[PDB]
Amino acid sequence: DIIIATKNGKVRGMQLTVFGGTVTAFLGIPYAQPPLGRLRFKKPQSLTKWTDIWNATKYANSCCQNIDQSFPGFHGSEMWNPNTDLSEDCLYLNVWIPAPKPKNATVLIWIYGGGFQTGTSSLHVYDGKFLARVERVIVVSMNYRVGALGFLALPGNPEAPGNMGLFDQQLALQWVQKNIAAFGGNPKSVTLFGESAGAASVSLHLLSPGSHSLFTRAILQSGSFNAPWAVTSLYEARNRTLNLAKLTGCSRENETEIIKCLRNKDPQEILLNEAFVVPYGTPLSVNFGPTVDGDFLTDMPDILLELGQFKKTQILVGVNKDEGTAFLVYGAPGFSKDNNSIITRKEFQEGLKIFFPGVSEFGKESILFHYTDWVDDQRPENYREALGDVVGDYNFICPALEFTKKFSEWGNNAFFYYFEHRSSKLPWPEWMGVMHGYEIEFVFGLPLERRDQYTKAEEILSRSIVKRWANFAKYGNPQETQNNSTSWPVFKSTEQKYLTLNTESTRIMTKLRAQQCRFWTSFFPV
Amino acid sequence: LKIFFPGVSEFGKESILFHYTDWVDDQRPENYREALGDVVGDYNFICPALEFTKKFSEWGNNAFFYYFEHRSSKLPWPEWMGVMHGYEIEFVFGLPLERRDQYTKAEEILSRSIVKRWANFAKYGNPQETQNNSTSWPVFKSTEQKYLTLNTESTRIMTKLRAQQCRFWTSFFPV
Amino acid sequence: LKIFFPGVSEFGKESILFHYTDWVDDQRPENYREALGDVVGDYNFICPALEFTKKFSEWGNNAFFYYFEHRSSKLPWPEWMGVMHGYEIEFVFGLPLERRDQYTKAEEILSRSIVKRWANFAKYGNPQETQNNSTSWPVFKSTEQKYLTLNTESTRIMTKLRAQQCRFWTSFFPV
Ligand SMILES: *[C@@H]1O[C@H](CO[C@H]2O[C@@H](C)[C@@H](O)[C@@H](O)[C@@H]2O)[C@@H](O[C@@H]2O[C@H](CO)[C@@H](O)[C@H](O)[C@H]2NC(C)=O)[C@H](O)[C@H]1NC(C)=O
Ligand SMILES: *[C@@H]1O[C@H](CO[C@H]2O[C@@H](C)[C@@H](O)[C@@H](O)[C@@H]2O)[C@@H](O[C@@H]2O[C@H](CO)[C@@H](O)[C@H](O)[C@H]2NC(C)=O)[C@H](O)[C@H]1NC(C)=O
Ligand SMILES: *[C@@H]1O[C@H](CO[C@H]2O[C@@H](C)[C@@H](O)[C@@H](O)[C@@H]2O)[C@@H](O)[C@H](O)[C@H]1NC(C)=O
Ligand SMILES: *[C@@H]1O[C@H](CO)[C@@H](O)[C@H](O)[C@H]1NC(C)=O
Ligand SMILES: *[C@@H]1O[C@H](CO)[C@@H](O)[C@H](O)[C@H]1NC(C)=O
Ligand SMILES: *[C@@H]1O[C@H](CO)[C@@H](O)[C@H](O)[C@H]1NC(C)=O
Ligand SMILES: *[C@@H]1O[C@H](CO)[C@@H](O)[C@H](O)[C@H]1NC(C)=O
Ligand SMILES: *[C@@H]1O[C@H](CO)[C@@H](O)[C@H](O)[C@H]1NC(C)=O
Ligand SMILES: [Cl-]
Ligand SMILES: [Cl-]
Ligand SMILES: [Cl-]
Ligand SMILES: [Cl-]
Ligand SMILES: [Cl-]
Ligand SMILES: [Cl-]
Ligand SMILES: [Cl-]
Ligand SMILES: [Cl-]
Ligand code: NA
Ligand code: NA
Numbered sequence: 001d002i003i004i005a006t007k008n009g010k011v012r013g014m015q016l017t018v019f020g021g022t023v024t025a026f027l028g029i030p031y032a033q034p035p036l037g038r039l040r041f042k043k044p045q046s047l048t049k050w051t052d053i054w055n056a057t058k059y060a061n062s063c064c065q066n067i068d069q070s071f072p073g074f075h076g077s078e079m080w081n082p083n084t085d086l087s088e089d090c091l092y093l094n095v096w097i098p099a100p101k102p103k104n105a106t107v108l109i110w111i112y113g114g115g116f117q118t119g120t121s122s123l124h125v126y127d128g129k130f131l132a133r134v135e136r137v138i139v140v141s142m143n144y145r146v147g148a149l150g151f152l153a154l155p156g157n158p159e160a161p162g163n164m165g166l167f168d169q170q171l172a173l174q175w176v177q178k179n180i181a182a183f184g185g186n187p188k189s190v191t192l193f194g195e196s197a198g199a200a201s202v203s204l205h206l207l208s209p210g211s212h213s214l215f216t217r218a219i220l221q222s223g224s225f226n227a228p229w230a231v232t233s234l235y236e237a238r239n240r241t242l243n244l245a246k247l248t249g250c251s252r253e254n255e256t257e258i259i260k261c262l263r264n265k266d267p268q269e270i271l272l273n274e275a276f277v278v279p280y281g282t283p284l285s286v287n288f289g290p291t292v293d294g295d296f297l298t299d300m301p302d303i304l305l306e307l308g309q310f311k312k313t314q315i316l317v318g319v320n321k322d323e324g325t326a327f328l329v330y331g332a333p334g335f336s337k338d339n340n341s342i343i344t345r346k347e348f349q350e351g352l353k354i355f356f357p358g359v360s361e362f363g364k365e366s367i368l369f370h371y372t373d374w375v376d377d378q379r380p381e382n383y384r385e386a387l388g389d390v391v392g393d394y395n396f397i398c399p400a401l402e403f404t405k406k407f408s409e410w411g412n413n414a415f416f417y418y419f420e421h422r423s424s425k426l427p428w429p430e431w432m433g434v435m436h437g438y439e440i441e442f443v444f445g446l447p448l449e450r451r452d453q454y455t456k457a458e459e460i461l462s463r464s465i466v467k468r469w470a471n472f473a474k475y476g477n478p479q480e481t482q483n484n485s486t487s488w489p490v491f492k493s494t495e496q497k498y499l500t501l502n503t504e505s506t507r508i509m510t511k512l513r514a515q516q517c518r519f520w521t522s523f524f525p526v
Numbered sequence: 527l528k529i530f531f532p533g534v535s536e537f538g539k540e541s542i543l544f545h546y547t548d549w550v551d552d553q554r555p556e557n558y559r560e561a562l563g564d565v566v567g568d569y570n571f572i573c574p575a576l577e578f579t580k581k582f583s584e585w586g587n588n589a590f591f592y593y594f595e596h597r598s599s600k601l602p603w604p605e606w607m608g609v610m611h612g613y614e615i616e617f618v619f620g621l622p623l624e625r626r627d628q629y630t631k632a633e634e635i636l637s638r639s640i641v642k643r644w645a646n647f648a649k650y651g652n653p654q655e656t657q658n659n660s661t662s663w664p665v666f667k668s669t670e671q672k673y674l675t676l677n678t679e680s681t682r683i684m685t686k687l688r689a690q691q692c693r694f695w696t697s698f699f700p701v
Numbered sequence: 702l703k704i705f706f707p708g709v710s711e712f713g714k715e716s717i718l719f720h721y722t723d724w725v726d727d728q729r730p731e732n733y734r735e736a737l738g739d740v741v742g743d744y745n746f747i748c749p750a751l752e753f754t755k756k757f758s759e760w761g762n763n764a765f766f767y768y769f770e771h772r773s774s775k776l777p778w779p780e781w782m783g784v785m786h787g788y789e790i791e792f793v794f795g796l797p798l799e800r801r802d803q804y805t806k807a808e809e810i811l812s813r814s815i816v817k818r819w820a821n822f823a824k825y826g827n828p829q830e831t832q833n834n835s836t837s838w839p840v841f842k843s844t845e846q847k848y849l850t851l852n853t854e855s856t857r858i859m860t861k862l863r864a865q866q867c868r869f870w871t872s873f874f875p876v
Contacts, residue, residue: 376631456551484690510683515659537715544712544876698873701719 006179009050014057015099018133019448022099025129026183027122028060031142031175032168034089040263041152041160043167044091060092061085062120063145064267066274070330076337076427080437082120088149088267093142093172094121095183096132102184106191106474107176109215110141111169113196113223113437116230116289117147117274130445134463135470138185140176144168148244148270148277151288152262153237159259162237162291166208169201170296173214190215191473195440196396197286199223200230203403204290207301207310217476219469220317221443222396222436224403225290225301229395232289240277240287247273280357283330284395305403308410314476316469317404317491318417318501322433324392327355329432332387340431341384348372348383355391363526370519384431389516394524396436398517405493415478416491416498418512424455439501443469457503465501530566538701545694559606564691569699571611573692580668590653591666591673593687599630614676618644632678640676705741713876720869734781739866744874746786748867755843765828766841766848768862774805789851793819807853815851 002013002024013026032044039045062082071077098105110126112119121141128139144150150165177187192215194202199220205211206218207225225231232240241258245251248269250261262270277287292300304310328335332351334343343351352364371386401416408414419439428435441447447454447462454462464480468488472478478488486506489497500507527539546561576591583589594614603610616622622629622637629637639655643663647653653663661681664672675682702714721736751766758764769789778785791797797804797812804812814830818838822828828838836856839847850857 375635378631456553460550508685537712537719540712540715 003053004182006182008047008179010053011056012053013095016129018129021133023129023132024097024099024101026056026095026097027058028092029054029056029095030060030091031093031172032091034091035145035164036088038263040088040149041164041259042158043161043164044171046171056095059084059094059122060143061087061090062122063090063143063147064088064149064271065114065118065146066271067118071337074337074427079125080114080118080123082118082122083124084120084122086267090143090145091168093140093175094128095180096128096139097183097185098132098136098138102136102138104181104186104189105136105138105184106189106470107138107140107180107185107187108469108473109173109176109190109192110139111144111192111194111198111201112141113194113198113200114146115284115286116151116165116197116200117286119146119197125441125444125446127444127446130448131466131470134445134448134466137470137473138180138183140172140180142169142172144172147274148288149267151232151290152241152244153232153234153288153291153293154241154255154259155234155238155291156294157255157259159256160241160262161295162293163296166201166204166290166296169205170208170211170214173205173211177214188216189474191217191219193219193221193443193469193473194223195221195437196223197230197289200225200227200290204297204301205311206313206315206407207304208296209298210296212311217313217473218311218315219472220315220400220403221439222319222323222400224317224400226305226403227395227399229284229286230289230399231301232286232291234291237291243277244270244273247276282355282357283327283332284355284391305406310407310410312410312412314413314415314472315404315407316415316417316472316478317400318419318439319392319397319400320434320436320439321418321420322388322392323396323436324390324394325388325432326428326436327391327395328388335384335387337429337432340381340429342380343383343387345372345383348387351387352390355387360526363524366524366526370516381431388433392436393513393516394520397513398520401496401512401517402521404491405496408491409493413476414491415472415488416496416512417488417501418498418509419501421458421461421502424458425453439465455503461501461503527562527565530562535701538699541699541701545691556606563608567611568688568691569695572688573695576671576687576692577696579666580671583666584668588651589666590647590663591671591687592663592676593673593684594676596633596636596677599633600628614640630678636676636678702737702740705737710876713874716874716876720866731781738783742786743863743866744870747863748870751846751862751867752871754841755846758841759843763826764841765822765838766846766862767838767851768848768859769851771808771811771852774808775803789815805853811851811853 002015003010004013011026011029013024016023016025030047032047033039035042035044062084064086065082067081068077108131110121110128112121112126121143126141128141131137131139145165145168150168151162152160153162154160155162176190180187192202192205200223202218202220203225205215223230245258245262248262248265250258250265252258252261274287275281278285281287290297328351329337331354334347335341349368352367356364356367367390371390374382404414404416420434422434423438423441426435426438442462442465445462445466446452447458450459464485467480468478486499486508488499489508491497496511497508498512500509527542531539531542542565546565549557579589579591595609597609598613598616601610601613617637617640620637620641621627622633625634639660642655643653661674661683663674664683666672671686672683673687675684702717706714706717717740721740724732754764754766770784772784773788773791776785776788792812792815795812795816796802797808800809814835817830818828836849836858838849839858841847846861847858848862850859
């Protein structure tokens with residue numbers, strides 16, 4: 001029986017057998033006051049003693065959020081949907097620790113993605129018992145509020161100041177600072193890791209003065225705050241808060257009255273109107289996201305990055321080979337998970353409209369000009385491939401490269417990976433390739449479990465990735481030093497070296513997407 | 527190994543086996559078939575070409591190194607034999623430039639590029655294709671050992687071709 | 702080799718044999734006796750000490766490396782065993798400084814120097830003997846790998862101790 005005394009009370013955990021060993025999991029520990037009633041849309045408030053043995057033996061509620069009902073019954077999409085009840089009372093975190101209890105273990109804190117509109121820490125692909133077992137690190141993960149409830153912003157107004165879900169993540173990081181030594185953890189060796197919006201969140205904790213001392217290093221998988229979906233302008237946020245108000249009959253003349261009104265709405269009426277706060281959306285819409293609130297984020301983060309105002313530490317950054325494909329089946333014409341999606345030039349052009357709402361005509365021709373000079377015009381999957389690359393390069397890959405470039409110019413070691421392995425079990429079709437989100441199960445070690453029907457080459461790839469992530473967290477260097485592995489070079493402006501992750505053998509290459517990102521990065525920002 | 531390494535101590539031949547048969551992993555049935563081909567190619571052609579280029583360039587001359595990785599759409603040999611010895615030649619001589627010939631369009635374009643690069647090398651000592659936003663071909667130096675890959679999709683600059691293999695053939699094997 | 706390398710594939714053990722028994726030349730009867738001692742010393746002590754020093758120094762700290770080559774005039778072990786493991790110790794602790802003890806004069810002087818060098822290292826981080834026009838002890842760096850020889854005649858600065866041997870133990874052997 002395992003009871004740990006925390007600053008706020010005792011917690012009981014549960015033992016887990018993993019790979020003939022034991023991990024202790026403390027699932028669903030609370031880290032803030034439930035943000036209900038009068039606390040809705042406010043910054044999370046600190047938690048007071050229970051006393052009391054809190055039983056942390058199951059995952060807690062996930063935060064309220066719309067769910068993906070596009071493919072009912074389909075594992076590829078439904079695997080991302082919440083797997084605990086939804087509730088505004090969702091501010092909990094999970095701790096997994098090796099057994100026997102470590103002495104001063106390095107801590108890995110996971111921040112989930114989901115567009116800032118969705119996600120939960122209890123997903124199966126985020127289960128941190130493999131990492132704790134195999135690498136003897138402690139893994140922590142937290143639920144933070146998403147959608148309007150986590151990011152609604154009425155700028156400067158503490159009733160809805162914005163970034164609440166980023167302040168939830170932050171209060172979780174404090175909880176680790178204050179409490180993790182009790183579980184056997186080293187609060188001085190804490191690495192944040194996150195994917196997509198979770199990565200973008202990691203990148204903003206790098207810029208946030210209040211997070212500076214809550215962690216040591218950072219890992220960004222498929223995301224960074226400079227991605228075009230990751231920060232809402234003050235203009236847009238205002239328009240959106242008011243549009244939500246209007247749609248819920250909460251329009252007022254006094255803004256504090258708007259918020260008061262919205263605090264009376266049911267979680268569901270808020271969720272139902274989120275999608276419409278915007279005249280046209282895309283499959284990549286982030287209606288309620290991070291904003292420059294003067295608190296968490298003191299200035300437009302592009303200025304902070306350019307001028308070197310951020311936590312000085314090592315970063316590990318990466319992307320997958322086919323980032324953009326996943327999104328094309330949520331609204332691009334001619335695209336289906338259920339056929340090979342060979343689309344036409346005219347369809348490609350219609351797709352640009354779906355993904356680039358407006359976007360001058362000249363803007364959209366320019367994408368077309370850049371991506372459709374074939375070599376050569378023979379290949380029927382030409383336009384289908386091009387639309388996926390457009391969406392991935394713009395939304396994920398070039399913004400990750402440009403973040404890494406700018407961060408490293410201030411003197412810190414940065415490591416960049418290009419993940420190019422398609423899981424043998426991917427439920428999505430072949431044409432979608434190495435999709436967004438599908439490195440995650442490799443990082444968390446799921447392929448280490450033989451009972452699971454991954455290939456042997458995949459077990460070995462995962463084992464290597466886990467070692468590299470763990471050495472990065474413990475030592476700031478993502479090497480696998482024992483098995484004559486390719487040495488991972490730092491990424492510098494100038495050479496821009498990166499490491500490819502695949503089952504055959506990993507290469508050092510240079511200047512990923514050079515020609516493409518010159519387009520997105522220099523020209524497109526029409 | 528006996529066919530290809532006549533004699534060749536037993537220890538000599540075990541050493542090849544040790545170097546080429548640590549699989550990742552022992553699952554794959556084409557493991558040994560692939561390994562024998564690489565043994566024969568690395569020993570006979572690839573490492574001696576790399577070592578020549580390394581030693582020649584150390585005396586101060588520009589050298590350019592390519593790794594040709596396109597399998598001809600018309601190869602009569604079976605698939606497992608891959609991008610065979612002798613089969614870049616028809617690309618260098620331009621045969622795929624002749625449309626009447628049933629090479630693909632991607633192959634015409636690859637050949638056209640290779641012909642330009644060989645011709646610029648001959649005329650100007652520099653195997654660049656300067657007009658079609660092509661990958662620039664870097665000189666090969668001891669130290670970085672940069673090379674250009676030739677294939678129909680897009681050509682890359684890489685480094686240290688067969689590094690681990692050629693350390694074996696080049697330093698140790700000469701048992 | 703069987704006594705010292707329990708198991709150790711047969712190939713593992715042939716490889717030691719191949720590396721250590723190419724004589725220059727096969728004439729010398731103490732050939733195999735010398736080779737077994739070097740195998741055991743290089744594997745167990747010398748190459749791992751060199752590789753430690755190499756890796757430690759790469760992170761920016763001064764490291765100093767010595768090669769002790771004096772056989773004590775009083776060693777009770779026979780001559781063929783040479784400058785044995787454990788037998789620098791009495792020099793470091795100063796026993797030869799005691800004349801009543803039947804060490805030679807050259808050994809008193811060697812010990813006095815070693816004691817000074819160890820003491821200056823401890824007090825000041827630098828194992829120099831600054832007063833008697835002594836050879837200056839250079840730091841050991843990856844790249845040059847300079848070391849100081851300790852013997853009664855005169856000490857030298859050399860480079861790359863056991864280079865060929867340790868490439869074997871250090872890169873290849875870890876069969
Ligand atoms: C700020 O909002 C308006 C959209 O007004 C919205 O009303 C909301 C409650 C919501 O239902 C939403 O769907 C609706 O659009 C944006 O201007 C809109 O542009 C289109 C173009 O025809 C009009 O049809 C909309 O009605 C028009 N607004 C109106 C009704 O006046 C505006 O773009 C947006 N500003 C942004 C984009 O930041
Ligand atoms: C691949 O499928 C797409 C997706 O739309 C279809 O899904 C199919 C599996 C099928 O059940 C079909 O009934 C369903 O609508 C096809 O795109 C569609 O093309 C059809 C053919 O006329 C149009 O009627 C639809 O407007 C269009 N769907 C939309 C709204 O995007 C696509 O044609 C098909 N392409 C192939 C097989 O290459
Ligand atoms: C735990 O170690 C503390 C220092 O941690 C450093 O060492 C590594 C863990 C590294 O990743 C860095 O994060 C840190 O700088 C030390 O101060 C504590 O006293 C230790 N606590 C124990 C053992 O109880
Ligand atoms: C809490 O849960 C544990 C584990 O299932 C159980 O053994 C224990 O009795 C519980 N304590 C109470 C009564 O809350
Ligand atoms: C807006 O209304 C709120 C309701 O409490 C009030 O506190 C605030 O002072 C009002 N300000 C004005 C005059 O707009
Ligand atoms: C190293 O390879 C061995 C087998 O040779 C494998 O069992 C082990 O898991 C590997 N270690 C890492 C961290 O990759
Ligand atoms: C350059 O590309 C053009 C078409 O854009 C092609 O026709 C021509 O043959 C190419 N030139 C070379 C030398 O590759
Ligand atoms: C230096 O040499 C002198 C005699 O010239 C000797 O007596 C003395 O012990 C030496 N000092 C050291 C530290 O070697
Ligand atoms: Cl799964
Ligand atoms: Cl057109
Ligand atoms: Cl074509
Ligand atoms: Cl690329
Ligand atoms: Cl395998
Ligand atoms: Cl290679
Ligand atoms: Cl002789
Ligand atoms: Cl030597
Ligand atoms: Na342009
Ligand atoms: Na060997």
